[PDB]
Ligand binder design. Structure first.
Ligand SMILES: *[C@@H]1O[C@H](CO)[C@@H](O[C@@H]2O[C@H](CO)[C@@H](O[C@@H]3O[C@H](CO)[C@@H](O)[C@H](O[C@H]4O[C@H](CO)[C@@H](O)[C@H](O)[C@@H]4O)[C@@H]3O)[C@H](O)[C@H]2NC(C)=O)[C@H](O)[C@H]1NC(C)=O
Ligand SMILES: *[C@@H]1O[C@H](CO)[C@@H](O[C@@H]2O[C@H](CO)[C@@H](O[C@@H]3O[C@H](CO)[C@@H](O)[C@H](O)[C@@H]3O)[C@H](O)[C@H]2NC(C)=O)[C@H](O)[C@H]1NC(C)=O
Ligand SMILES: *[C@@H]1O[C@H](CO)[C@@H](O[C@@H]2O[C@H](CO)[C@@H](O)[C@H](O)[C@H]2NC(C)=O)[C@H](O)[C@H]1NC(C)=O
Ligand SMILES: *[C@@H]1O[C@H](CO)[C@@H](O[C@@H]2O[C@H](CO)[C@@H](O)[C@H](O)[C@H]2NC(C)=O)[C@H](O)[C@H]1NC(C)=O
Ligand SMILES: *[C@@H]1O[C@H](CO)[C@@H](O[C@@H]2O[C@H](CO)[C@@H](O)[C@H](O)[C@H]2NC(C)=O)[C@H](O)[C@H]1NC(C)=O
Ligand SMILES: *[C@@H]1O[C@H](CO)[C@@H](O[C@@H]2O[C@H](CO)[C@@H](O)[C@H](O)[C@H]2NC(C)=O)[C@H](O)[C@H]1NC(C)=O
Ligand SMILES: *[C@@H]1O[C@H](CO)[C@@H](O[C@@H]2O[C@H](CO)[C@@H](O)[C@H](O)[C@H]2NC(C)=O)[C@H](O)[C@H]1NC(C)=O
Ligand SMILES: *[C@@H]1O[C@H](CO)[C@@H](O[C@@H]2O[C@H](CO)[C@@H](O)[C@H](O)[C@H]2NC(C)=O)[C@H](O)[C@H]1NC(C)=O
Ligand SMILES: *[C@@H]1O[C@H](CO)[C@@H](O)[C@H](O)[C@H]1NC(C)=O
Ligand SMILES: *[C@@H]1O[C@H](CO)[C@@H](O)[C@H](O)[C@H]1NC(C)=O
Ligand SMILES: *[C@@H]1O[C@H](CO)[C@@H](O)[C@H](O)[C@H]1NC(C)=O
Ligand SMILES: *[C@@H]1O[C@H](CO)[C@@H](O)[C@H](O)[C@H]1NC(C)=O
Ligand SMILES: *[C@@H]1O[C@H](CO)[C@@H](O)[C@H](O)[C@H]1NC(C)=O
Ligand SMILES: *[C@@H]1O[C@H](CO)[C@@H](O)[C@H](O)[C@H]1NC(C)=O
Lengths: 213, 237, 230, 112, 112
């Protein structure tokens, strides 16, 4: 038995309702379960038997349907609902999960908070230097990050890490790490990160000089 | 075990001294006290008795007492004084949870009745003892040695508080000694009215149901009903 | 309530065998259905197997038939999963789940899903060896202060394999803590940096300590973060 | 589409009164323990998990049955023994002397 | 063992019916008569239950499906909160009112 879940991705503002449709290749009576999973956390069951609400789950989640079509509805979206949703069948072995839908939260555009930091002396003792610049609480997630070492653009030596959307204010955070050898770090003096964001009128550049606090 | 005013050879509580009553505010009800540790008691009849057989008919004999060789002394029991002190302290400490923290609690002796209900009556190896417990329950409590209880011996026995049937206990030959555990108490409370700040407890008994109610107090009997109906989604084929 | 406790992370070699344990608290073990599931990094869920211990005949997926074994121990109330001949694609997070079932007679059993989930165990197979983590304190400075809020943290480098657990003040501080996901470098090892933003007035009064744990290497490092002396 | 299904052997119970029987470990005793069933060496005790019950110490019907059994055994033990009807006569009694103590005066009598 | 699942859910207790089923048949002159009556009464209760099961069309079964649909006025709870969040002792206390109606329906459905 194959389960198809639609839509693949969906984003709505706070206060609106969303619907996810799970379709079965053949009749499974009403043996469907809806699960929710947050990043870095085990899945949590929301709905069992297709429409029976689990204990401890808010009333905002509703499940319905029968035959081969089932629907999960969120009436009042909340900042903690950005997560991955799955529909699973247990009527007949083997049990199969759906592909899952990543529900995201839409909010107003927020300007990032820019910070920068050169590598610590303990890391410098190892011969490797990592300069890290961070953008905090910026929405939407898409942004442009560039590295400039002595007014020279750097490519192929930077790694960007993006956390998932926050469950409180629905804002993203990004970290750009530039990793070089000790000789390359002490060769140059000025290091800067340039950030371009939709809510920023002009790109924000954070720069520092080697050997200065 | 058949005894009055004291529970012998019974079971001990696991944590503390337990006080049980059907209605603790009603003074017409008895109070059952269960100890945490036992109190050893040694009872003895020291006379060297002789038994003689008298033929009273074809194939029927009667066992009488002959002569007592040596001197004649009184049967008695010994209990420990410090152990009884500690036990009464624990009992009054547990009692002060139902009547207040500033009430004087005093133990007195029995008040009126026949020989069975006013004495610790028990059976020690074929002989029926009736011991006087005025030295055990006599004290008051405000917020090496031994105690000797003299006893009497009786040979015509009326058991179960009935009338119309009596039993004769043939004499036992030789000196008699027994050792037992005190593991509980039966008490009754005097109805002190007119703003009484003190409580007086007296030993009681007489009804043997409270003797075996202190052992069958954690059991109940149930009857199984192995038939049920429930909604499923299976249909008969 | 019902709780499931699993073993720690596992690192193995190709062609070897791996065994995982899952212990249950709060239910009768013999009449409760237990299932083993797995999740690949960046992929969906894959129901591996499951069974009721009383029946004694587990159900398997045809893909994993001949490689997967599921057993139980009622004396210790723990279920064991054994996977043999691991391949390069078997590195994943394995979950132990539980659910209730009933019977309508004649060998029919009806289930309700998987209400209880474990925390998951990370299983990795590769040619690399264990490496103790290296911790470097990302100290706060004037360049990391904006509007009275200064950002500090701790970076972890030169460690393998996953995972590493990072906490602040033994879990006392949780607000404003961002732990970026680990990334893969050309050297074959991982790296990450867990940061936190705190008011600048507390830099000289509040002590910040990052506790990092690397269970497969059995490493526990507590690194204190202080503003850089100038 | 739900149907009634019958289950035989469900764990349900009610309060009841019945006759319990006696058992003793495995000869002349007042309580005929020899006539009771022998007792198993290792009895079974099954702890009922998550079960809360109600007990009443003062309205238990096992106490009445125990009292009746004890009385009946005591009455039964006296059937084959000697009757002392000829002992209800007039006795001529004297006080007992010869090495009694002060507390033992008048407690024994010598009757012919 | 016996009555082990008295605190477990209805679903968990449906897999151990034979344990309760087995412990219903074998598990002076005054006392001899009393003990005999207990055994006769146990046999009579077992035979009455067996006759009822046979009349309902469920002879020699522990779980038996029927053709009688479940009326929603007997209980409105769904299957998820009956077999997974309930015990038999609670279920009996709720359906004690409608037991005779269900029994009569079972009898008249099997006969016709
Ligand atoms: C509380 O329990 C204790 C311990 O069970 C109990 O003390 C025991 O008392 C009995 C009865 O007096 C003692 O048993 C006697 O011991 C000697 C040695 O055998 C003899 O006097 C007795 O045997 C003679 O009589 C028997 C009767 O027919 C004959 O069969 C036998 O051949 C002998 O002629 C008898 O066995 C027992 O020794 C003590 N135990 C201790 C440790 O002292 C106590 O009496 C109980 N208390 C109450 C109030 O019931
Ligand atoms: C029915 O009774 C059983 C016990 O007879 C209850 O199971 C108990 O559930 C608690 C839930 O907290 C378990 O405690 C937990 O244990 C471990 C070890 O410490 C850990 O996960 C937690 O820190 C917590 O302490 C407890 O171990 C467990 N007992 C047994 C014997 O497994 C059950 O909850 C009861 N059911 C209901 C519905 O009340
Ligand atoms: C326990 O006994 C007390 C008396 O010791 C009962 O309380 C009495 O209740 C009656 C009415 O039923 C009142 O007229 C009396 O004045 C009460 N007596 C006292 C001293 O307050 C009490 O009802 C009994 N409890 C039970 C459960 O029967
Ligand atoms: C109970 O204790 C008394 C007192 O110790 C014992 O009676 C005798 O007491 C005198 C002194 O009054 C001692 O010289 C004797 O040694 C005691 N008699 C014996 C046999 O030792 C009495 O014996 C004790 N009774 C029991 C049953 O222990
Ligand atoms: C009751 O009698 C027992 C012995 O039957 C006494 O226990 C003995 O006490 C003496 C004196 O302290 C010790 O030397 C013995 O070793 C004890 N014997 C045993 C077997 O323990 C006990 O003291 C007596 N109790 C009372 C209150 O007189
Ligand atoms: C309870 O104790 C009192 C006080 O000791 C006993 O009363 C004594 O009775 C005797 C005769 O039996 C008299 O010689 C005493 O003078 C009385 N004493 C007092 C202070 O009046 C009473 O008999 C005891 N009750 C019992 C043993 O049931
Ligand atoms: C029980 O013992 C008490 C205390 O030993 C006895 O009370 C004493 O009785 C005698 C006469 O037997 C009087 O001379 C004493 O004055 C009484 N003592 C007190 C303190 O009043 C009591 O009589 C005994 N009970 C009996 C023998 O039935
Ligand atoms: C009880 O009385 C009897 C007599 O009725 C006593 O037995 C007699 O004692 C005298 C004096 O020693 C002897 O000459 C006789 O031979 C004894 N026998 C008879 C049949 O007369 C007996 O000593 C008394 N016992 C006690 C304890 O006082
Ligand atoms: C008295 O109590 C002690 C301690 O609990 C116990 O070992 C002993 O057997 C008891 N004695 C009698 C005679 O029951
Ligand atoms: C026994 O405990 C119950 C509560 O469990 C209480 O209502 C009752 O009064 C208690 N009885 C006594 C005598 O303490
Ligand atoms: C009691 O008297 C008999 C018979 O003379 C004797 O054998 C025994 O030792 C005596 N018992 C004592 C004095 O304790
Ligand atoms: C018994 O207890 C009383 C009341 O506390 C005390 O006065 C007396 O000294 C004690 N007797 C002893 C320890 O022998
Ligand atoms: C009585 O005093 C004891 C002393 O330990 C105390 O624990 C208890 O609470 C008091 N009870 C009251 C004041 O009712
Ligand atoms: C009762 O106790 C008092 C006070 O200690 C004492 O004088 C009296 O002799 C006692 N009565 C007895 C032991 O019979």
């Amino acid at each position: 038995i194959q389960l198809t879940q639609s839509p693949s991705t969906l984003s709505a503002p706070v206060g609106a309702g969303v619907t996810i449709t799970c379709q079965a290749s053949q009749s499974i009576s009403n043996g469907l379960a809806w699960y929710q999973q947050k990043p870095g956390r085990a899945p949590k069951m929301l709905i069992t038997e297709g429409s029976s609400l689990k204990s401890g789950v808010p009333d905002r989640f509703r499940g319905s349907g029968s035959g081969t079509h089932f629907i999960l509805t969120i009436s009042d979206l909340q900042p903690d609902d950005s997560a991955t949703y799955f529909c699973q069948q247990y009527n007949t072995f083997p049990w199969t999960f759906g592909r899952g839908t990543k529900v995201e939260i839409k909010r107003t555009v927020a300007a990032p908070s820019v910070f920068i930091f050169p590598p610590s002396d303990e890391q410098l003792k190892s011969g490797t230097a990592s300069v890290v610049c961070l953008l905090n609480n910026f929405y939407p997630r898409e942004a442009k990050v560039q590295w400039k070492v002595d007014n020279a653009l750097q490519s192929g030596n930077s790694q960007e890490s993006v956390t998932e959307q926050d469950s409180k204010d629905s804002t993203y955070s990004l970290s750009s790490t530039l990793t070089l050898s000790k000789a390359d770090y002490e060769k140059h003096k000025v290091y800067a990160c340039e950030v371009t964001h939709q809510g920023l009128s002009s790109p924000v550049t954070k720069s520092f000089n080697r050997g200065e606090c | 075990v058949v005894s009055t005013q004291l529970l012998l050879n019974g079971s001990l509580a696991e944590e503390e001294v337990m006080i049980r009553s059907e209605n603790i505010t009603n003074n017409a009800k008895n109070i059952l006290v269960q100890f945490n540790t036992p109190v050893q008691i040694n009872c003895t009849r020291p006379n060297n008795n002789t038994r003689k057989s008298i033929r009273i008919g074809p194939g029927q004999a009667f066992y009488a007492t002959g002569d007592i060789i040596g001197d004649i002394r009184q049967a008695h029991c010994n209990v420990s004084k410090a152990t009884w002190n500690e036990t009464l302290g624990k009992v009054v400490k547990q009692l002060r949870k139902h009547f207040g923290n500033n009430t004087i609690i005093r133990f007195a002796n029995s008040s009126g009745g026949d020989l069975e209900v006013t004495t610790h009556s028990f059976n020690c190896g074929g002989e029926f003892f009736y011991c006087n417990t005025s030295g055990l329950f006599n004290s008051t409590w405000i917020s090496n040695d031994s105690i000797t209880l003299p006893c009497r011996i009786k040979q015509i026995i009326n058991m179960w508080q009935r009338i119309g049937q009596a039993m004769y206990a043939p004499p036992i030959q030789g000196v008699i000694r027994c050792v037992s555990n005190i593991t509980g108490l039966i008490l009754t409370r005097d109805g002190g009215s007119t703003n009484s700040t003190t409580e007086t407890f007296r030993p009681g008994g007489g009804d043997m149901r409270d003797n075996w109610r202190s052992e069958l107090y954690k059991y109940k009997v149930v009857k199984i009903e192995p038939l049920g109906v429930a909604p499923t989604r299976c249909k008969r084929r | 309530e019902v709780q499931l406790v699993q073993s720690g992370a596992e690192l193995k070699k190709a062609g070897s065998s791996v065994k995982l344990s899952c212990q249950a608290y709060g239910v009768a073990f013999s009449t409760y259905s237990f299932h083993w599931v797995r999740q690949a990094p960046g992929q969906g869920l894959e129901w591996l197997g499951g069974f009721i211990p009383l029946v004694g005949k587990p159900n398997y997926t045809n893909k994993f038939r001949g490689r997967l074994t599921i057993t139980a121990d009622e004396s210790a109330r723990t279920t064991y999963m054994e996977l043999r001949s691991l391949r390069s694609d078997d590195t994943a997070i394995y979950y132990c789940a539980g659910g209730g079932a009933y019977s309508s007679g004649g060998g029919r059993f009806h289930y309700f899903g998987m209400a209880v989930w474990g925390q998951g165990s990370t299983v990795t197979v590769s040619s690399a060896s264990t490496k103790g983590p290296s911790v470097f304190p990302l100290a706060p400075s004037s360049k990391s202060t904006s509007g009275g809020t200064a950002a500090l943290g701790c970076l972890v480098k030169d460690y393998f394999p996953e995972p590493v657990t990072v906490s602040w003040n033994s879990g006392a501080l949780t607000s404003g803590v961002h732990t970026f996901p680990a990334v893969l470098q050309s050297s074959g090892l991982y790296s990450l940096s867990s940061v936190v933003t705190v008011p600048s007035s507390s830099l000289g009064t509040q002590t910040y300590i990052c506790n990092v744990n690397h269970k497969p290497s059995n490493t526990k490092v507590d690194k204190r973060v202080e503003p850089k002396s100038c | 589409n739900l149907w009634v299904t019958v289950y035989y052997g469900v764990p349900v119970w009610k309060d009841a009164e019945t006759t319990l029987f006696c058992a003793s470990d495995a000869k002349h005793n007042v309580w005929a323990t020899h006539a009771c069933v022998p007792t198993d060496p290792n009895p079974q005790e099954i702890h009922l998990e998550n079960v809360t019950e109600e007990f009443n110490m003062w309205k238990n019907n096992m106490v009445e049955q125990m009292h009746t059994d004890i009385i009946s055994l005591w009455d039964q033990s006296l059937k084959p023994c000697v009757k002392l009807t000829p002992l209800c006569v007039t006795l001529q009694c004297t006080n007992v002397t010869n090495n009694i103590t002060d507390d033992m005066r008048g407690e024994l009598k010598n009757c012919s | 063992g016996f009555l082990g699942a008295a605190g477990s859910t209805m679903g968990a207790a449906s897999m151990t019916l034979t344990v309760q089923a087995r412990n219903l048949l074998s598990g002076l002159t005054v006392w001899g008569i009393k003990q005999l009556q207990a055994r006769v009464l146990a046999v009579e209760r077992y035979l009455r239950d067996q006759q009822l099961l046979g009349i309902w069309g469920c002879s020699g079964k522990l779980i038996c499906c029927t053709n009688v649909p479940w009326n929603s006025s007997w209980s409105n709870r769904n299957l998820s909160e009956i077999w997974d969040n309930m015990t038999w002792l609670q279920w009996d206390k709720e359906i004690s009112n409608y037991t005779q109606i269900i029994y009569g329906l079972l009898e008249e459905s099997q006969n016709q």
